[PDB]
Write a protein that holds these residues in place. Structure first.
Motif, PDB file in Angstrom:
ATOM      1  N   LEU A  46      12.026  -1.439  97.804  1.00  0.00           N
ATOM      2  CA  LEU A  46      11.424  -0.913  96.546  1.00  0.00           C
ATOM      3  C   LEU A  46      12.362  -1.199  95.365  1.00  0.00           C
ATOM      4  CD1 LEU A  46       8.900   0.635  95.351  1.00  0.00           C
ATOM      5  CD2 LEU A  46      10.204   2.705  95.571  1.00  0.00           C
ATOM      6  N   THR A  47      13.661  -0.941  95.568  1.00  0.00           N
ATOM      7  CA  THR A  47      14.675  -1.209  94.558  1.00  0.00           C
ATOM      8  C   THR A  47      14.706  -2.726  94.266  1.00  0.00           C
ATOM      9  OG1 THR A  47      16.076   0.706  95.150  1.00  0.00           O
ATOM     10  CG2 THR A  47      17.168  -1.141  94.010  1.00  0.00           C
ATOM     11  N   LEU A  48      14.622  -3.546  95.314  1.00  0.00           N
ATOM     12  CA  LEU A  48      14.681  -5.003  95.124  1.00  0.00           C
ATOM     13  C   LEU A  48      13.462  -5.450  94.358  1.00  0.00           C
ATOM     14  CD1 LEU A  48      15.991  -7.855  95.378  1.00  0.00           C
ATOM     15  CD2 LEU A  48      15.002  -7.965  97.752  1.00  0.00           C
ATOM     16  N   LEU A  49      12.301  -4.887  94.692  1.00  0.00           N
ATOM     17  CA  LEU A  49      11.067  -5.210  93.959  1.00  0.00           C
ATOM     18  C   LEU A  49      11.167  -4.995  92.429  1.00  0.00           C
ATOM     19  CD1 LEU A  49       8.068  -6.104  93.899  1.00  0.00           C
ATOM     20  CD2 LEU A  49       7.472  -3.747  94.536  1.00  0.00           C
ATOM     21  N   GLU A  50      11.684  -3.824  92.064  1.00  0.00           N
ATOM     22  CA  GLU A  50      11.976  -3.511  90.653  1.00  0.00           C
ATOM     23  C   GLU A  50      12.930  -4.543  90.003  1.00  0.00           C
ATOM     24  OE1 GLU A  50      13.192   0.594  90.139  1.00  0.00           O
ATOM     25  OE2 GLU A  50      11.846   0.651  88.372  1.00  0.00           O
ATOM     26  N   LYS A  51      14.042  -4.860  90.670  1.00  0.00           N
ATOM     27  CA  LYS A  51      14.964  -5.917  90.209  1.00  0.00           C
ATOM     28  C   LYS A  51      14.281  -7.274  89.983  1.00  0.00           C
ATOM     29  CE  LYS A  51      19.283  -4.046  92.223  1.00  0.00           C
ATOM     30  NZ  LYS A  51      20.233  -3.633  91.129  1.00  0.00           N
ATOM     31  N   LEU A  52      13.414  -7.670  90.892  1.00  0.00           N
ATOM     32  CA  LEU A  52      12.758  -8.954  90.765  1.00  0.00           C
ATOM     33  C   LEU A  52      11.728  -8.930  89.633  1.00  0.00           C
ATOM     34  CD1 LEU A  52      12.291  -9.734  94.644  1.00  0.00           C
ATOM     35  CD2 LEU A  52      13.814 -11.032  92.962  1.00  0.00           C
ATOM     36  N   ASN A  53      11.043  -7.792  89.515  1.00  0.00           N
ATOM     37  CA  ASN A  53      10.199  -7.540  88.346  1.00  0.00           C
ATOM     38  C   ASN A  53      10.977  -7.636  87.053  1.00  0.00           C
ATOM     39  OD1 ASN A  53       7.760  -7.334  89.577  1.00  0.00           O
ATOM     40  ND2 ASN A  53       7.972  -5.140  89.895  1.00  0.00           N
ATOM     41  N   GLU A  54      12.134  -6.987  86.974  1.00  0.00           N
ATOM     42  CA  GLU A  54      12.982  -7.057  85.804  1.00  0.00           C
ATOM     43  C   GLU A  54      13.475  -8.502  85.489  1.00  0.00           C
ATOM     44  OE1 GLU A  54      17.351  -4.993  84.506  1.00  0.00           O
ATOM     45  OE2 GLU A  54      15.807  -3.825  85.553  1.00  0.00           O
ATOM     46  N   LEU A  55      13.666  -9.331  86.519  1.00  0.00           N
ATOM     47  CA  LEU A  55      14.078 -10.749  86.366  1.00  0.00           C
ATOM     48  C   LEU A  55      12.895 -11.618  86.039  1.00  0.00           C
ATOM     49  CD1 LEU A  55      16.470 -11.192  89.520  1.00  0.00           C
ATOM     50  CD2 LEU A  55      17.176 -11.822  87.136  1.00  0.00           C
ATOM     51  N   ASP A  56      11.707 -11.018  86.003  1.00  0.00           N
ATOM     52  CA  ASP A  56      10.470 -11.763  85.846  1.00  0.00           C
ATOM     53  C   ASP A  56      10.238 -12.844  86.923  1.00  0.00           C
ATOM     54  OD1 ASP A  56       8.772 -10.674  83.769  1.00  0.00           O
ATOM     55  OD2 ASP A  56      10.456 -11.008  82.388  1.00  0.00           O
ATOM     56  N   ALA A  57      10.798 -12.610  88.123  1.00  0.00           N
ATOM     57  CA  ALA A  57      10.777 -13.605  89.212  1.00  0.00           C
ATOM     58  C   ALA A  57       9.535 -13.343  90.021  1.00  0.00           C
ATOM     59  CB  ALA A  57      12.051 -13.524  90.065  1.00  0.00           C
ATOM     60  N   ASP A  58       8.417 -13.799  89.451  1.00  0.00           N
ATOM     61  CA  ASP A  58       7.047 -13.408  89.814  1.00  0.00           C
ATOM     62  C   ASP A  58       6.737 -13.674  91.256  1.00  0.00           C
ATOM     63  OD1 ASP A  58       6.701 -13.089  86.915  1.00  0.00           O
ATOM     64  OD2 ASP A  58       4.604 -13.748  87.148  1.00  0.00           O
ATOM     65  N   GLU A  59       7.044 -14.892  91.670  1.00  0.00           N
ATOM     66  CA  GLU A  59       6.691 -15.358  93.006  1.00  0.00           C
ATOM     67  C   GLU A  59       7.427 -14.528  94.098  1.00  0.00           C
ATOM     68  OE1 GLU A  59       7.460 -17.099  90.182  1.00  0.00           O
ATOM     69  OE2 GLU A  59       5.916 -18.648  90.009  1.00  0.00           O
ATOM     70  N   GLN A  60       8.671 -14.188  93.793  1.00  0.00           N
ATOM     71  CA  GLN A  60       9.549 -13.449  94.693  1.00  0.00           C
ATOM     72  C   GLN A  60       9.177 -11.981  94.720  1.00  0.00           C
ATOM     73  OE1 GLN A  60      10.877 -15.866  92.447  1.00  0.00           O
ATOM     74  NE2 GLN A  60      10.774 -17.298  94.189  1.00  0.00           N
ATOM     75  N   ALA A  61       8.907 -11.423  93.545  1.00  0.00           N
ATOM     76  CA  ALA A  61       8.378 -10.065  93.410  1.00  0.00           C
ATOM     77  C   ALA A  61       7.094  -9.874  94.241  1.00  0.00           C
ATOM     78  CB  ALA A  61       8.154  -9.714  91.908  1.00  0.00           C
ATOM     79  N   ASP A  62       6.184 -10.851  94.231  1.00  0.00           N
ATOM     80  CA  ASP A  62       4.959 -10.723  95.037  1.00  0.00           C
ATOM     81  C   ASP A  62       5.245 -10.717  96.546  1.00  0.00           C
ATOM     82  OD1 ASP A  62       3.813 -10.730  92.409  1.00  0.00           O
ATOM     83  OD2 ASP A  62       2.816 -12.648  92.678  1.00  0.00           O
ATOM     84  N   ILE A  63       6.167 -11.566  96.981  1.00  0.00           N
ATOM     85  CA  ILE A  63       6.619 -11.539  98.375  1.00  0.00           C
ATOM     86  C   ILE A  63       7.275 -10.182  98.658  1.00  0.00           C
ATOM     87  CG2 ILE A  63       8.242 -12.461 100.098  1.00  0.00           C
ATOM     88  CD1 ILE A  63       7.775 -15.245  98.673  1.00  0.00           C
TER      89      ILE A  63
END
Lengths: 58, 57
Positions: free
Chosen positions: A20-37
């Motif tokens: 969940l924490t990693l998801l937020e970080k990836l969202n904050e990085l705008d790393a869309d493809e990774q956030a969806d995974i």
């Protein structure tokens, strides 16, 4: 209700909180493809937590 | 290769490692149903890790 059973369940909860924490970080990085995974990985982590909860929980 | 990028990549690698630590614990417990979900969860953490690695290099 052994210490082994409680360790496993706490780990399953931890992995869920990590994803969940990693998801937020990836969202904050705008790393869309990774956030969806990661979003999917978090659901899967929640499935594991729930299965461990049913089996090892008090 | 930005800092934030690297923290994220590290965490993705850390989570992959944790699924394996839980997998072995579940094995020790003979918790077969939970172990199989964990096994698949590791496969999924590996998918995420490799994707972060390709992107954050």
């Amino acid at each position: 209700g052994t210490k082994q059973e409680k360790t496993a369940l706490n780990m399953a909860r931890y992995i869920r909180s990590q994803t969940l924490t990693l998801l937020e970080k990836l969202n904050e990085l705008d790393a869309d493809e990774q956030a969806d995974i990661c979003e999917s990985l978090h659901d899967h982590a929640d499935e594991l937590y729930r299965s461990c909860l049913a089996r090892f929980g008090d």
